[PDB]
Design a binder for this molecule. Structure first.
Ligand SMILES: [Hg+2]
Ligand SMILES: [Hg+2]
Ligand SMILES: [Hg+2]
Ligand SMILES: [Hg+2]
Ligand SMILES: [Hg+2]
Ligand SMILES: [Hg+2]
Ligand SMILES: [Hg+2]
Ligand SMILES: [Hg+2]
Ligand SMILES: [Hg+2]
Ligand SMILES: [Hg+2]
Ligand SMILES: [Hg+2]
Ligand SMILES: [Hg+2]
Lengths: 238, 241, 245, 243
């Protein structure tokens, strides 16, 4: 809690990027999920594969656009893990998780505004365990999946160069984006997308469903527990 | 600005021929993919919307890679406009590019019609318009926010140090830009078609020539230009100290 | 670099010259195999959307191209395509000797790769077009020729735009290439051209297929797949050398 | 030299094997889970398609190898290790340790899938490789020898020359091409045997799924890849690659 950062000008820009990023990340991804679901014709949409690209591809573009500014996180769990590694200050982190949180809700909120009809009607792009999977699994998938995301993140951090005015490493976007893409190609059937507390959170809010809200804890505990293990594995044993 | 001193430069007429030819191939490959997909009788026998998304984002990547060193690689009126507002492109240059791009599009699109007039007219001619189930206000919303993703990336992709030939127009990273065109398409095709191109929407509107299309055509210019503006401002005024 | 004297048998004597040939042979053998095997696997599929679909095919072609140019860039210059060669020849980046040997290699290569797939699955191989280019119903020969010309232009123009000014292949003046852009160029063009004749843009890839499949209907249209890419090749070359860089 | 009694004694040496173990583990978890999720799908086109599966396999390799080059040299594959061993770039000791780690990482990954979705997992081929109806075991072996050649020849072509891993004198590999190799081969071999080119990946799926029909053909995915890996090695080391 070195409150000296708040005073820096750059620090406020970094939060603004993370907010807009996540706003963007959530709008594009979720708008895509829906555009799929509302499709009447067979193979007439982009498909679950299309969705998967949306998620890892946006991440890639975003981490690219904001790497040099905030360090391109767009994910609480990504911040959390980098925090446990102490490459981010307690002050910075809590500010980030908030901006991503507010980022998501506006991102998802925006879509519902463009297509409220099919929005509510088709899941509203809200994470929740799928028929045939116990919560025990949904959490397992979520944990291990986020381990892949974060472990990539650490492996893709520039050791020398850091975010403008800070000791927060530059993230090489391509591997991270792909990692996201991959984890989506496997976890979608389980509980759609995840490994992103702010993504699920932003979705649960604008959708508003007890069923949704009930499983919502998994998408916070899993991503965070994974990010934890990841940091551990990468620093304590590598 | 208005420095007519450029017109006289030999490099200036190339960066325009490139943008012209670049945008011609762009519309040809993409629109051709669109028709090709639509005329498909076999279910799941085409490349699908996912295929079309790639044809766009993909062409942008390639076309920008090819022409970045020469014209700076814009291929998009809204991308030029945004940098123009950033004062990284003269007003004189901008107006030329823009004419060559709209001029490139119309030929590119018209070449697809020449290839297969039959299924071309029959399946939308690859022109943007508002999809049933959406209000013109939303189409414009998606168009703005869509283009904000494209141009904000163009800004995030500019090269600080080196530039184009004969100018101070930055070389652009091709991949992040292509992926952006791609991403935006995956989410906007259901609504309008992923316009985020004026020159692209114009070329096909011109060649398809449908009133229903010409009607919504105004959104595809206003939306992009607005998005690009807000992007420029966001990158320049809000970010970049 | 100086324009390499037009016919200097002198390279024949070079050990690296023959290596580059082989690399180009084997590369086209793998190119055709991985791709044509993919095409077949898609056609033989009984289940709706049980194959990889056309997008899957489009990738096979762009993808392998990417991978192959990467793997051979420093050994032969990464051509894998008579039309790319011919195009690099007109700009005098490649001697008339290498260009002719490369060409012979790519075909011999193409004919093996395909033949090797037919050897893996003869039934469906023959039952589903043999992975050969030909004009699709509802498209007149002239459009076929146009698509191929224009398509190849896209491929070649990118090759030129991908060549490295200060980095060349091993023991040669031939320019080294950036495989990713080139790969994508091939990918893109297929997405647009498959519906038409195929994604040709490869005299060798078309020839090897026609050879092993061997159909009158195929052999009839085959000429398009040579003239189209070359003309396209030439124009990109002229475009890049003459009206630009 | 060869035996190298001293490799065991190094602290980095053990680190690598771990990476390789965690690596191969993830790989199988992510791919296999994708395969199942696809198969157990009820809706038509409701899944990611075989294309997604192919991507899963190539993409994972890409990513995984990007995370493990500097540490272990990013093999994640016996065939790749074997091929790199024949090129004397990986000692006999490190090759044996690597393969165990890769086999042990594999089964865990596959098992981890089963545990999550035992139901559809057993009902849909368990994601293990086997010759499919219509193809003769001979073709399966060729497609597997030829498909691995593509993989190993790329690994060899991605090989960095003036750079190595952390403390081992083992080459860092450029990830993207390799992943695409894996992606491509998958696109052409899946319909035949689902594109193995990975002893570790095949073995682990045969272990966890436990089927005779499967164990029957299980020799193809061991004999093939290694033969491919070796041929590649000979093409690249001997008949090519000089200055
Ligand atoms: Hg939060
Ligand atoms: Hg908000
Ligand atoms: Hg990873
Ligand atoms: Hg214009
Ligand atoms: Hg025109
Ligand atoms: Hg962006
Ligand atoms: Hg030939
Ligand atoms: Hg042959
Ligand atoms: Hg091009
Ligand atoms: Hg083993
Ligand atoms: Hg195990
Ligand atoms: Hg290769």
């Amino acid at each position: 809690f070195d409150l000296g950062e708040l005073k820096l000008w750059s620090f406020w820009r970094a939060a603004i990027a993370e907010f807009i990023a996540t706003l963007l990340f959530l709008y594009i991804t979720v708008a895509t999920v829906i555009g799929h679901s509302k499709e009447t014709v067979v193979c007439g949409s982009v498909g679950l594969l299309g969705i998967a690209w949306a998620f890892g591809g946006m991440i890639f573009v975003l981490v690219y656009c904001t790497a040099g500014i905030s360090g391109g996180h767009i994910n609480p769990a990504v911040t959390f893990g980098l925090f446990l590694a102490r490459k981010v200050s307690l002050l910075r982190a809590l500010v980030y998780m908030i901006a991503q949180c507010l980022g998501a809700i506006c991102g998802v909120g925006l879509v519902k505004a463009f297509m409220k009809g099919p929005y509510n009607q088709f899941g509203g792009g809200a994470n929740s365990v799928a028929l045939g999977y116990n919560k025990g699994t949904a959490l397992g998938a979520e944990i291990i999946g986020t381990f892949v995301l974060v472990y990539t993140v650490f492996s893709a951090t520039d050791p020398k160069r850091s975010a403008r005015d800070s000791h927060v490493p530059i993230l090489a976007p391509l591997p991270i984006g792909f990692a996201v893409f991959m984890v989506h190609l496997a976890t979608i059937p389980i509980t759609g997308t995840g490994i992103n507390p702010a993504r699920s959170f932003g979705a649960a809010v604008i959708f508003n469903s007890n069923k949704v809200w009930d499983d919502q804890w998994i998408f916070w505990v899993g991503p965070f527990i994974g990010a934890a293990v990841a940091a551990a594995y990468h620093q304590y044993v590598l």
